[PDB]
Swiss-Prot record, chains A, B:
Identification of the protein by name: Alpha-2-macroglobulin
UniProt subcellular location: Secreted
Source organism (scientific name): Homo sapiens
Cystine connections: C15-C129
UniProt similarity note: Belongs to the protease inhibitor I39 (alpha-2-macroglobulin) family.
Whole-protein residues included: 1338 to 1468 of 1474
Glycosylation sites (chain numbering): N86
Length: 130, 130
């Protein structure tokens, strides 16, 4: 059982051209559906597809939201959500191909409450030209 | 006084804390109150407060209603309505502070008929912490 609804899409969704190989946006949607009225502070952890890096200003721009901190470390983007309720929060940022890698595999995204254990969900996404 | 009724408010309405400095919602309401039964195609044109930009997905979200399309362009948000009648349409979207600018002055919102140059309204709004 997952007390968060988590889904991830890319923009573009398909390998629709040369540009889709070297850059795409990641678009995450999250809400809280568990036993409590709402989450506490929560973290969304996005792992990068192999060879991809996040574009810093589009990560920092998420802080303008209902997000109070972000971090880029070790090929992960961390997003600190203030509070998650039954309303869907959508977050979008850009990634860039730093190193082309063959055989691109899916990357996992996790969301978890910062303070209560076993309040988490997982999902995955792929580069559009995988 | 205009053949359109046009009102604009921001969420939050005042500078209620740190987050009000860096993002807010723009909420506008419009109806046609003129001689004619309804307006033709009308355009709503929202100019950004200095330093702010729209959160594009919340603009694109408007596109389902009397709303035939939206555009983000040269730091205006443009909303195309197929027709406007006496019933009030409310449209709400998010803007984000990209760069902090000193001394924020009010920004203009317009609605006008695609054909009748005499049929327009104007209203002002300010960033909550301007
Ligand atoms: C971040 O969360 C806030 C909640 O505080 C959202 O603000 C609400 O937005 C809706 C929809 O436009 C309004 O109907 C509510 O009145 C707002 N409430 C407040 C307290 O402002 C906001 O939409 C969220 N920002 C996102 C989703 O990016
Ligand atoms: Ca649990």
């Amino acid at each position: 059982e997952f007390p968060f609804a988590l889904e991830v899409q890319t923009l573009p969704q398909t390998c629709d051209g040369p540009k889709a190989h070297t850059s795409f946006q990641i678009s995450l949607s999250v809400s809280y559906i568990g036993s409590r009225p709402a989450s506490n502070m929560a973290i969304v952890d996005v792992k990068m597809v192999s060879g991809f890096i996040p574009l810093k200003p589009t990560v920092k721009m998420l802080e303008r939201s209902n997000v109070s901190r972000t971090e880029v470390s070790n090929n992960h983007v961390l997003i600190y959500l203030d509070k998650v309720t039954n309303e869907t929060l959508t977050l979008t940022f850009t990634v860039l191909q730093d190193i082309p890698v063959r055989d691109l595999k899916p990357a996992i995204v996790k969301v978890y409450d910062y303070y209560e254990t076993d309040e988490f969900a997982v999902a995955e996404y792929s580069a559009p030209c995988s």
